[PDB]
Amino acid sequence: DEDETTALVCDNGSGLVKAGFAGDDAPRAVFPSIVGRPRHQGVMVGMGQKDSYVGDEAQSKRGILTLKYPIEHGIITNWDDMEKIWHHTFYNELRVAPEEHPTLLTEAPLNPKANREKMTQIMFETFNVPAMYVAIQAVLSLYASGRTTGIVLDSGDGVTHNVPIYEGYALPHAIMRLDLAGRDLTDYLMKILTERGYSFVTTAEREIVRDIKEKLCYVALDFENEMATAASSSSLEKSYELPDGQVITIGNERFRCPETLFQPSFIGMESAGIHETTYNSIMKCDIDIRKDLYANNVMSGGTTMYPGIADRMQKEITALAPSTMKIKIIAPPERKYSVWIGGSILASLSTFQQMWITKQEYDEAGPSIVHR
Amino acid sequence: MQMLKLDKENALDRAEQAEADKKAAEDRSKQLEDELVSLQKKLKGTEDELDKYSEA
Amino acid sequence: MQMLKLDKENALDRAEQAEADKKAAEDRSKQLEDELVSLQKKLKGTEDELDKYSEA
Amino acid sequence: SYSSYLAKADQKRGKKQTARETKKKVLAERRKPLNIDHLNEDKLRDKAKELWDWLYQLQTEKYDFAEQIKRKKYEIVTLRNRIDQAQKHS
Amino acid sequence: EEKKRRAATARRQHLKSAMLQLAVTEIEKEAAAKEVEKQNYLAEHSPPLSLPGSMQELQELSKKLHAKIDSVDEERYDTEVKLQKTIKELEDLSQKLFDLRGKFKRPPLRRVRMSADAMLRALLGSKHKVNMDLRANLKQV
Amino acid sequence: TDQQAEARAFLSEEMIAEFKAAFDMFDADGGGDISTKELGTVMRMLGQNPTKEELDAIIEEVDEDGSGTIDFEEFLVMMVRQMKEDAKGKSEEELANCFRIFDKNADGFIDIEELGEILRATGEHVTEEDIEDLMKDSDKNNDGRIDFDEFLKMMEGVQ
Numbered sequence: 001d002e003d004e005t006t007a008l009v010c011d012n013g014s015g016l017v018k019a020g021f022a023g024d025d026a027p028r029a030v031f032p033s034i035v036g037r038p039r040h041q042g043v044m045v046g047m048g049q050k051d052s053y054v055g056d057e058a059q060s061k062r063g064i065l066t067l068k069y070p071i072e073h074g075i076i077t078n079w080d081d082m083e084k085i086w087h088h089t090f091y092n093e094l095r096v097a098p099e100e101h102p103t104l105l106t107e108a109p110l111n112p113k114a115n116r117e118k119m120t121q122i123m124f125e126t127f128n129v130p131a132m133y134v135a136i137q138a139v140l141s142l143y144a145s146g147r148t149t150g151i152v153l154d155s156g157d158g159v160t161h162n163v164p165i166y167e168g169y170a171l172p173h174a175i176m177r178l179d180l181a182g183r184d185l186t187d188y189l190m191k192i193l194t195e196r197g198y199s200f201v202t203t204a205e206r207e208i209v210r211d212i213k214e215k216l217c218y219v220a221l222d223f224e225n226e227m228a229t230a231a232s233s234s235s236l237e238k239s240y241e242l243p244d245g246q247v248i249t250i251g252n253e254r255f256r257c258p259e260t261l262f263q264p265s266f267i268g269m270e271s272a273g274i275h276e277t278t279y280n281s282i283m284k285c286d287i288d289i290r291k292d293l294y295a296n297n298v299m300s301g302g303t304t305m306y307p308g309i310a311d312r313m314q315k316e317i318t319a320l321a322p323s324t325m326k327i328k329i330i331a332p333p334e335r336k337y338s339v340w341i342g343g344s345i346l347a348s349l350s351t352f353q354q355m356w357i358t359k360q361e362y363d364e365a366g367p368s369i370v371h372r
Numbered sequence: 373m374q375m376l377k378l379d380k381e382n383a384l385d386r387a388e389q390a391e392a393d394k395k396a397a398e399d400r401s402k403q404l405e406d407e408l409v410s411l412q413k414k415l416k417g418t419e420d421e422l423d424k425y426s427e428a
Numbered sequence: 429m430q431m432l433k434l435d436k437e438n439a440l441d442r443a444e445q446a447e448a449d450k451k452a453a454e455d456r457s458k459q460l461e462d463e464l465v466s467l468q469k470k471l472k473g474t475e476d477e478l479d480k481y482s483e484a
Numbered sequence: 485s486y487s488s489y490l491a492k493a494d495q496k497r498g499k500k501q502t503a504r505e506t507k508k509k510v511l512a513e514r515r516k517p518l519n520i521d522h523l524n525e526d527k528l529r530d531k532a533k534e535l536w537d538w539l540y541q542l543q544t545e546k547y548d549f550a551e552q553i554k555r556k557k558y559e560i561v562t563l564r565n566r567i568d569q570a571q572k573h574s
Numbered sequence: 575e576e577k578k579r580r581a582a583t584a585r586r587q588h589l590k591s592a593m594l595q596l597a598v599t600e601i602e603k604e605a606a607a608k609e610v611e612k613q614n615y616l617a618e619h620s621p622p623l624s625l626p627g628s629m630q631e632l633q634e635l636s637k638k639l640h641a642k643i644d645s646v647d648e649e650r651y652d653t654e655v656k657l658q659k660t661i662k663e664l665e666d667l668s669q670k671l672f673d674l675r676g677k678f679k680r681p682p683l684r685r686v687r688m689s690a691d692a693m694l695r696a697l698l699g700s701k702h703k704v705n706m707d708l709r710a711n712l713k714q715v
Numbered sequence: 716t717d718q719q720a721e722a723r724a725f726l727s728e729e730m731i732a733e734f735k736a737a738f739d740m741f742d743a744d745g746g747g748d749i750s751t752k753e754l755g756t757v758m759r760m761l762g763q764n765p766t767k768e769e770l771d772a773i774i775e776e777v778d779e780d781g782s783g784t785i786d787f788e789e790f791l792v793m794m795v796r797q798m799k800e801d802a803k804g805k806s807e808e809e810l811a812n813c814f815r816i817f818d819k820n821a822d823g824f825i826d827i828e829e830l831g832e833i834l835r836a837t838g839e840h841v842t843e844e845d846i847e848d849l850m851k852d853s854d855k856n857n858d859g860r861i862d863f864d865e866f867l868k869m870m871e872g873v874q
Contacts, residue, residue: 001681004672004677005672005676024673025673130776131772215413354768356772359781360751360770360771360773360774360783361768361771361772363778363781363782363783364771364783373429373432376429376432376433377432380432380435383439387440387442387443387446390447394447394449394453397450397453397457398457401453401454401460404457404464408463411464411467411471412467415471418471418474422481425478425481426481445490448485448486448488448489448490449487450487451486507651510651511644511651518637518640522633525628525629528632528633528636529625529632532625532635532639533623535640539643540616543616543620543646544616546646546649546650546653547616549657553656556657556660556661556664557660559664559682560660560663560664561821563667563671564667564823565862566671567671569856569858570674570675586852589834589839589841589845589849590849590873591874592837592838592839593813594813594870594874595837597812598813601813678864679807679864680807684804687800689797689801690794690797694733697761698733698736698737698740703729703733704727707802710725710727711727711728
């Protein structure tokens with residue numbers, strides 16, 4: 001129990017932090033990855049002067065603060081502001097004292113060696129946690145779907161990745177990163193919806209375009225004869241009621257937004273798209289392992305939640321793969337937390353105890369110890 | 373050889389038919405499941421607009 | 429003969445799998461379609477309790 | 485749901501067959517032939533009992549492993565009641 | 575204003591302790607009795623051996639035993655495995671409760687290291703006089 | 716150091732006295748702290764066989780000064796946590812057992828009937844009202860029985 005209860009799992013994202021206790025089924029804490037700094041001197045009624053704001057209080061009060069994102073494209077870019085988000089996570093969100101909890105953290109696919117050593121330096125030397133561990137994100141997603149070999153298409157708020165994993169070892173030279181994700185996708189909907197003849201003028205109009213994207217957006221299979229369908233004008237249309245009455249209608253654009261993930265050309269991106277990239281990762285791997293990867297395309301991440309994403313991907317890679325092959329696109333329902341759940345499982349596991357980096361290992365080996 | 377060829381063609385035609393109406397069962401499933409997250413969603417909305425107008 | 433036998437066994441195993449998850453797609457279809465006539469029903473009810481309390 | 489029937493066969497048969505040989509491998513090791521046959525006469529005496537003890541040895545353990553499961557089986561019954569009691573979907 | 579109510583509670587305690595006190599003394603009864611059953615069971619399944627004559631008997635008996643050994647051993651094995659299965663079943667249940675409550679009392683597996691009382695005894699042998707449990711110590715008279 | 720406080724606050728001179736004698740034997744050279752090696756020796760004398768990883772973890776559990784060694788203070792802390800855990804385990808075990816004795820019908824519960832029996836089984840004099848009263852006070856989920864959880868709670872304190 002000492003640490004059975006006690007292991008923490010913190011998944012640091014570009015848009016959201018997911019956090020909680022190893023053992024739980026889902027994150028106890030989910031909140032924006034921002035750190036707000038007040039543009040002016042003054043106070044809220046009853047509070048003192050605050051130097052900084054994090055998560056939702058930074059979002060809610062955004063009009064008087066300069067908002068900053070510590071993690072650009074999955075990599076920690078500002079370490080002063082990240083230690084601020086961690087502090088908030090332990091002390092306010094989970095309300096635990098960190099110096100008696102083992103902490104499993106996550107990093108990104110080709111996270112620079114030096115960063116994995118730096119967050120270890122900050123975990124052990126400024127938070128004084130007993131022990132910690134850094135798992136790679138795609139690797140926890142895979143594992144949370146039971147398996148050990150597969151290829152994860154991972155897509156969240158600032159990055160998309162393909163991480164081919166074989167008997168647990170993520171394959172460095174076959175990993176692909178595509179910098180277009182849910183953030184890019186909300187801003188494109190924004191324009192095709194103002195372009196539908198609308199105005200997201202106040203900040204209460206801006207924010208909810210993102211809630212339109214999440215609730216009403218679709219990834220149609222045969223996106224071709226779906227536009228064609230749009231035109232005959234079926235009961236395909238969908239009206240959403242705004243903060244007030246102002247019933248906005250979205251028929252068609254509803255799927256023009258996730259067609260951006262297959263066609264980056266919709267947004268002036270010259271890069272290849274999700275399905276081709278799944279494939280290219282795969283023809284960059286060893287030959288003998290390619291049947292395995294093909295029957296185990298595990299999807300994780302908030303942006304892979306658009307319904308019919310899996311069917312489109314299913315048919316997208318069948319038709320690029322040699323017919324002798326078995327294609328299989330696994331997309332679980334909890335996928336917006338796969339990464340986290342894979343960490344919860346792993347860290348609550350009976351056999352993981354012997355991989356925890358302890359302060360004994362650290363004080364004796366330097367940050368190098370956990371770096372592997 | 374001949375026997376194995378003929379019962380093979382009949383295995384493949386039954387496979388092709390069984391794949392075709394499967395595609396159809398899955399598309400109808402997906403359609404109904406989607407119409408639903410829409411109706412069930414519309415409802416949390418009408419029931420919440422409700423405790424609100426009844427309290428007001 | 430040998431080739432026709434082996435791609436025949438692979439035609440039959442793909443047929444058997446395709447029948448099995450078809451059964452599964454149809455059972456989930458039925459289940460979701462039934463949960464629905466129930467949710468959509470519950471709704472005409474909460475929306476009609478509504479025009480009533482809203483008018484009152 | 486009948487496409488999962490082929491899963492039953494593969495799965496069950498698989499695991500069960502895996503378990504078998506293991507049990508065979510394991511049990512085989514702990515077995516040293518009765519090689520000593522007609523090498524001495526009083527040997528049987530100092531031998532027979534040793535076998536006797538080994539038997540008694542195993543017997544006694546089997547009894548303990550047994551009583552153990554019973555106790556555990558009860559731990560379960562209780563651990564299940566705590567699970568239901570701790571349900572309250574409230 | 576329920577001034578007397580205080581005595582009611584003390585009763586439950588007095589009784590609770592009358593219960594536990596009862597428990598403990600019954601606990602060792604069942605324990606020893608249990609053992610008794612164990613020696614009787616063994617009493618017949620493998621009674622005080624009596625080495626036979628000399629020729630065919632010793633050999634025969636030996637063969638008899640040796641075969642039974644593989645027998646009992648197999649049974650011993652099957653049993654060990656049904657235990658494994660069981661311990662497994664409750665570990666899972668010992669989970670379905672954790673992430674539904676948290677750390678709860680009396681986990682079935684219990685990861686225990688040696689007690690400090692043990693380590694102390696082990697290391698100082700003779701001079702280890704402190705029936706440690708919890709009782710703090712504050713100046714007597 | 717804050718821990719080393721209550722820790723020493725917890726123990727008695729007697730305790731410290733012995734825990735010292737014990738600590739001294741841990742410490743070979745007699746310098747002032749157990750090293751990752753000095754510990755290994757004692758562990759084996761104690762009948763274990765830890766690995767480098769295992770040892771350190773056991774060390775840096777009470778190494779507040781990131782020394783990589785344990786001083787008679789960090790040690791007392793360690794003894795304390797143990798003393799605690801030991802006593803907790805022994806308690807829950809006993810109660811656990813008591814529950815099985817009181818249960819006997821093995822339904823995993825203790826119904827007003829058994830509660831009466833066991834109670835009446837004590838020497839003490841009791842009338843039904845007492846029994847049903849203790850039931851009503853113990854049964855928090857008001858289901859009639861007393862689950863292990865409740866039993867832990869109800870016996871919480873009692874000796």
